């Protein structure tokens, strides 16, 4: 880009490619999102507008967004590192609960500043959020299927990662409701606790058995309409659900209340940002400085 020094490719993100930059002029650091063809749609650089405006400290700030030779680029605030380094990184010794409670209280607060803004992420995963020395954990790459549509890749040639997606979704739910996220986060805060996936489908239906497989093929007791949903079929292995306690040792049972409130089938019964805020298990919560190695 003319106004922009590609120090180097940070990713191939869902809808482009992101690379680290240096604002020739301003000298700010900033990754850059070029996106995805042949004339680009205007109800999307709307829905972007408006995420420019989104601002919050557990939030990637969206600096600028520019419409310009079929190409949609997007300037947001650089960060370091991502969870799924830090959690590669941590894999041998974990993350300490303590910082584990922190990110997810930090996430929480940036999910109940999204969806009170009626702004939903929809496709949170740990390489989508981003931490700094300070403590701090950011929400990037808002999925914005609704702006601009969920491809199959990314753009070209990469799959996408089904672990973190909502039984809604998978079910075939055509309105996605604030829910969603606080499914993907809780496989998320599971998986910091475990340092494993809790469900790493590599097909749609595999991610679907394997979370049936874990809470029990849900039913219309658990949720209801569930039955009724586009892509469910009676002919589903019907799988008991495994006691809880085995999901995610050693997590206290404040930690597993809270993770079960996440994971309810049911989206209407799936606990949210605000209420999970409140919950016991952040009685404690405190912000440590995490160990990162740039
Ligand atoms: C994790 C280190 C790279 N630094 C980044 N810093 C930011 N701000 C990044 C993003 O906003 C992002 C992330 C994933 C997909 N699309 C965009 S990536």
């Given at each position: 880009m003319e106004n922009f020094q590609?120090?180097?490719?940070?990713g191939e993100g869902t809808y482009g490619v992101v690379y680290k930059a240096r604002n020739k002029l301003t000298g700010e650091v900033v990754a850059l999102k070029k996106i995805r063809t042949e004339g680009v749609p205007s109800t999307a650089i709307r829905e972007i507008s408006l995420l420019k405006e989104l601002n919050h400290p557990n939030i990637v700030k969206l600096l600028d967004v520019i419409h310009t030779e079929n190409k949609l680029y997007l300037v947001f605030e650089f960060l370091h590192q991502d969870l799924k380094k830090f959690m590669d990184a941590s894999a041998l010794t974990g993350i300490p609960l303590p910082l584990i409670k922190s990110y997810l209280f930090q996430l929480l607060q940036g999910l109940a500043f999204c969806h009170s803004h009626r702004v939903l992420h929809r496709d949170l995963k740990p390489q989508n959020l981003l931490i700094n020395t300070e403590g701090a954990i950011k929400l990037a790459d808002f999925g914005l299927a609704r702006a601009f549509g969920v491809p199959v890749?990314?753009?070209?040639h990469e799959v996408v990662t089904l672990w973190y997606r909502a039984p809604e979704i998978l079910l075939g739910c055509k309105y996605y409701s604030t829910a969603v996220d606080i499914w993907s986060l809780g496989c998320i805060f599971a998986e910091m606790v475990?340092?494993?996936?809790?469900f790493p489908g590599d097909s749609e239906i595999d991610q679907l058995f394997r979370i049936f497989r874990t809470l029990g093929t849900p039913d219309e007791v658990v949720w209801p309409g569930v039955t009724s949903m586009?892509?469910?079929?009676?002919?589903f292995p019907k799988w008991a659900r495994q006691?809880?306690?085995?999901?995610?040792?050693?997590?206290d049972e404040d930690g597993r209340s809270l993770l079960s409130q996440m994971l309810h089938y049911d989206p209407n019964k799936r606990i949210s940002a605000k209420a999970a805020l409140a919950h016991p298990f952040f009685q404690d919560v405190t912000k440590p400085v995490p160990h990162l190695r740039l």
């Open positions: 590609k120090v180097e490719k940070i890749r990314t753009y070209t475990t340092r494993r996936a809790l586009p892509d469910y079929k009676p002919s006691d809880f306690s085995k999901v995610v040792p050693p997590l």
